[PDB]
Amino acid sequence: GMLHYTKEDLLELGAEITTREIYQQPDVWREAFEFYQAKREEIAAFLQEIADKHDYIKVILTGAGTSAYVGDTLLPYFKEVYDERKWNFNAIATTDIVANPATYLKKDVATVLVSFARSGNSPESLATVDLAKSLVDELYQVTITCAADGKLALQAHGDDRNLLLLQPAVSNDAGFAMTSSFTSMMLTTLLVFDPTEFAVKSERFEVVSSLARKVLDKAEDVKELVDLDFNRVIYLGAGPFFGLAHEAQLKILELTAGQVATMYESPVGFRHGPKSLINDNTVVLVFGTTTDYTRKYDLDLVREVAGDQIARRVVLLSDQAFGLENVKEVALGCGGVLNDIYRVFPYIVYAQLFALLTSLKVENKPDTPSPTGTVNRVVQGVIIHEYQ
Amino acid sequence: GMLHYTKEDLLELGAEITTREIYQQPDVWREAFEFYQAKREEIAAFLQEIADKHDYIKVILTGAGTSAYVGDTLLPYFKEVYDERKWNFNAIATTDIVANPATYLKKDVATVLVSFARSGNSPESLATVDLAKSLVDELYQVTITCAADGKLALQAHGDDRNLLLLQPAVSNDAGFAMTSSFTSMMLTTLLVFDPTEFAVKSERFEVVSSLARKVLDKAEDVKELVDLDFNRVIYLGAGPFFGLAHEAQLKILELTAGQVATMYESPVGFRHGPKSLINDNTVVLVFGTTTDYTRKYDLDLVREVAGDQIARRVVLLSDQAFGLENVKEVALGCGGVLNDIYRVFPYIVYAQLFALLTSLKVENKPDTPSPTGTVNRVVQGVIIHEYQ
Numbered sequence: 182g183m184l185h186y187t188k189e190d191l192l193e194l195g196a197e198i199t200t201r202e203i204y205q206q207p208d209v210w211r212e213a214f215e216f217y218q219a220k221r222e223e224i225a226a227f228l229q230e231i232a233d234k235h236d237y238i239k240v241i242l243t244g245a246g247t248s249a250y251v252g253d254t255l256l257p258y259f260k261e262v263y264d265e266r267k268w269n270f271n272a273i274a275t276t277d278i279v280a281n282p283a284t285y286l287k288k289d290v291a292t293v294l295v296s297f298a299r300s301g302n303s304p305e306s307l308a309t310v311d312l313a314k315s316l317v318d319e320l321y322q323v324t325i326t327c328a329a330d331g332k333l334a335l336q337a338h339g340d341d342r343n344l345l346l347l348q349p350a351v352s353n354d355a356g357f358a359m360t361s362s363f364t365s366m367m368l369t370t371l372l373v374f375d376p377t378e379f380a381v382k383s384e385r386f387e388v389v390s391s392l393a394r395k396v397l398d399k400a401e402d403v404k405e406l407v408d409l410d411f412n413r414v415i416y417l418g419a420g421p422f423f424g425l426a427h428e429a430q431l432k433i434l435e436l437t438a439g440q441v442a443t444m445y446e447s448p449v450g451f452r453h454g455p456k457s458l459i460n461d462n463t464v465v466l467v468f469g470t471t472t473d474y475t476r477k478y479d480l481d482l483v484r485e486v487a488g489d490q491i492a493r494r495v496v497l498l499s500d501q502a503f504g505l506e507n508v509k510e511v512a513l514g515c516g517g518v519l520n521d522i523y524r525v526f527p528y529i530v531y532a533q534l535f536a537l538l539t540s541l542k543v544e545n546k547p548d549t550p551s552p553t554g555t556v557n558r559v560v561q562g563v564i565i566h567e568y569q
Numbered sequence: 570g571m572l573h574y575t576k577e578d579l580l581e582l583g584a585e586i587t588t589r590e591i592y593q594q595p596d597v598w599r600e601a602f603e604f605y606q607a608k609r610e611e612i613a614a615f616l617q618e619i620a621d622k623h624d625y626i627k628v629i630l631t632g633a634g635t636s637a638y639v640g641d642t643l644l645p646y647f648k649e650v651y652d653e654r655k656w657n658f659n660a661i662a663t664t665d666i667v668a669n670p671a672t673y674l675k676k677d678v679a680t681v682l683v684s685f686a687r688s689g690n691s692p693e694s695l696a697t698v699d700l701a702k703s704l705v706d707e708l709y710q711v712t713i714t715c716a717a718d719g720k721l722a723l724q725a726h727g728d729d730r731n732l733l734l735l736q737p738a739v740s741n742d743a744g745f746a747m748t749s750s751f752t753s754m755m756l757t758t759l760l761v762f763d764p765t766e767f768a769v770k771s772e773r774f775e776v777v778s779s780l781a782r783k784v785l786d787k788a789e790d791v792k793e794l795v796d797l798d799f800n801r802v803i804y805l806g807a808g809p810f811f812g813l814a815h816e817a818q819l820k821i822l823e824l825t826a827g828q829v830a831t832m833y834e835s836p837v838g839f840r841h842g843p844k845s846l847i848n849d850n851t852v853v854l855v856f857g858t859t860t861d862y863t864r865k866y867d868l869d870l871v872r873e874v875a876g877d878q879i880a881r882r883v884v885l886l887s888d889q890a891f892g893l894e895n896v897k898e899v900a901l902g903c904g905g906v907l908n909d910i911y912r913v914f915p916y917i918v919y920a921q922l923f924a925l926l927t928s929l930k931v932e933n934k935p936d937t938p939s940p941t942g943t944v945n946r947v948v949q950g951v952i953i954h955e956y957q
């Protein structure tokens with residue numbers, strides 16, 4: 182198990198489901214990868230037909246909450262590697278689309294709507310699909326969802342323009358918080374759209390899974406941070422790690438019922454006002470980039486915040502430790518096998534453990550962390566209004 | 570005067586500069602508008618030449634901190650009204666470009682780089698321009714900045730392809746926080762790229778000015794809210810009001826040196842986890858959208874948060890009061906002359922007052938609000954590294 186905890190301890194503390202769902206991630210990813218591998222020809226044919234038909238293609242990666250951050254996290258990688266004049270990638274939350282459809286859904290633009298959902302039962306998921314069908318003349322869909330009996334999945338069959346990519350059944354997280362659903366969806370999406378050769382994807386997958394298991398094995402390293410005196414947490418990252426930070430900090434908010442206040446930023450963005458949030462009771466964690474160029478900017482920022490000596494702790498997740506003063510460096514090293522976009526997986530596993538253990542520290546029940554009932558596993562109170 | 574305060578009172582409190590710069594906004598905006606009026610034919614001709622040469626044009630709206638939020642706020646409006654296959658609008662912070670230039674700056678894409686800066690002395694401003702010039706074959710620039718002797722402005726002369734649009738000198742805010750600088754730059758940008766007829770823009774400008782004066786006249790109303798017990802502030806807004814919420818919350822952070830923790834979200838996004846931050850010492854303010862359809866989603870959310878009865882106060886800025894239970898409704902009514910994108914101006918004045926008065930409440934010196942010196946008016950410690 183995790184730390185010393187027995188399964189019995191975890192049940193008594195209301196953390197068995199969430200702990201199980203975090204720890205099952207490498208196994209879930211291997212199933213997802215194998216499903217990808219079996220479907221890869223069909224998936225590539227699907228996308229190729231669209232490319233053959235249309236000169237400009239708007240791809241919209243869309244979900245709500247943690248499902249929105251799937252697109253946010255992967256977006257900068259796709260933007261780098263694709264020519265925007267052909268495949269124009271966007272991450273637009275379902276919660277944005279439902280409120281302002283006209284901003285995003287345009288009649289004459291060929292559009293591939295890539296819908297993400299753990300439960301499939303957020304009203305905004307179906308409303309976004311329905312608005313897209315209403316407003317876009319040439320619409321295709323890729324539906325990436327974990328619940329085969331969720332409304333999103335149920336309405337995604339028998340349509341030659343909708344590629345349904347169900348995630349493994351156990352990734353339909355019963356926990357309040359999305360854990361294995363988030364990472365499984367993100368892995369599927371990266372495998373689908375990453376133009377890298379299959380053999381390279383395979384190798385990277387194996388290293389992703391190895392690194393993640395190492396993180397899980399060393400939960401005590403995360404506990405060391407949890408044990409510090411803090412009630413604010415700030416996650417920072419550049420590139421894909423900006424959306425990853427957004428997810429990492431949300432996991433805290435959610436699992437501590439906001440008893441820990443939070444922020445996400447990039448390291449370079451952080452200086453321009455947001456850094457004001459730091460106080461003596463703040464932990465700052467950086468998801469480090471490993472390209473030589475971008476790493477330099479991370480390092481200057483970590484040096485500065487450590488040097489300020491205000492924060493309780495500055496933590497840098499990277500591929501190596503330089504031996505920085507007043508920084509906890511967490512070295513997760515691939516031998517360089519992984520590029521940055523695949524490092525999101527072990528990095529978020531660390532973040533999930535931090536959120537889980539912090540929930541336990543504050544005596545919240547991670548599996549059911551909103552005792553007021555004002556936040557819910559499946560969103561409540563969403564009304565869809567008719568658009569004309 | 571603001572409230573009871575004399576100029577000597579404000580001097581004593583370290584608030585004279587910021588108070589002045591907020592209150593000068595209507596006058597600054599008229600000067601900005603008159604400049605635009607004078608230059609509009611030249612401006613249109615500049616953009617028309619670009620459209621005459623290139624089939625696909627990438628517009629990048631770029632700044633750091635509050636300057637980034639000019640682009641974030643206006644972007645959804647430009648996205649709605651432009652055809653993305655011709656004019657493809659993006660808001661990408663200078664703090665993102667400098668760290669990951671290859672994500673955004675593409676050799677073969679005709680690009681219009683629209684740079685924002687109050688001081689012009691952020692290293693990322695010049696690095697962003699330099700990276701664009703070194704990477705993009707067909708580049709044009711629009712430089713919108715408040716400091717004629719800032720480094721950005723000073724390198725923007727004598728270039729046919731760089732359209733320099735200096736803002737009124739007094740908008741080079743001496744206060745730590747950007748107030749009139751943000752608004753002047755945002756007004757100029759909207760006037761440049763809004764395809765509405767000039768006669769309509771002039772009509773709206775007059776109502777903007779009038780409503781903003783009314784907000785300033787009624788500072789006592791904001792004070793009443795600031796007097797409530799709270800240490801967390803959440804701003805919510807849809808469409809342009811998401812970026813505006815980002816700015817509104819940053820103002821609090823900056824001016825209270827993080828003594829008040831903050832969040833920005835959209836009303837519909839808020840439910841999917843972020844709502845967890847609410848506690849009994851939290852004030853939630855919503856920048857209300859006035860289109861019939863989107864407004865319905867604001868209203869559902871406000872009803873819900875009010876009905877939960879946890880937050881200290883729920884405040885809705887709009888064009889009218891419906892008479893909502895447990896909500897403070899602030900009605901700023903144009904008679905319907907203003908569309909939502911022009912309502913950002915009166916809305917942000919209200920949020921500036923809220924931040925300034927909260928700063929006074931916590932006995933910070935709003936003009937110089939970082940007594941640790943770890944956050945600065947002009948960013949310190951940014952090193953620019955060579956990109957290959």
Ligand SMILES: [Cl-]
Pocket residue numbers: 793794882897
């Ligand atoms: Cl009140």
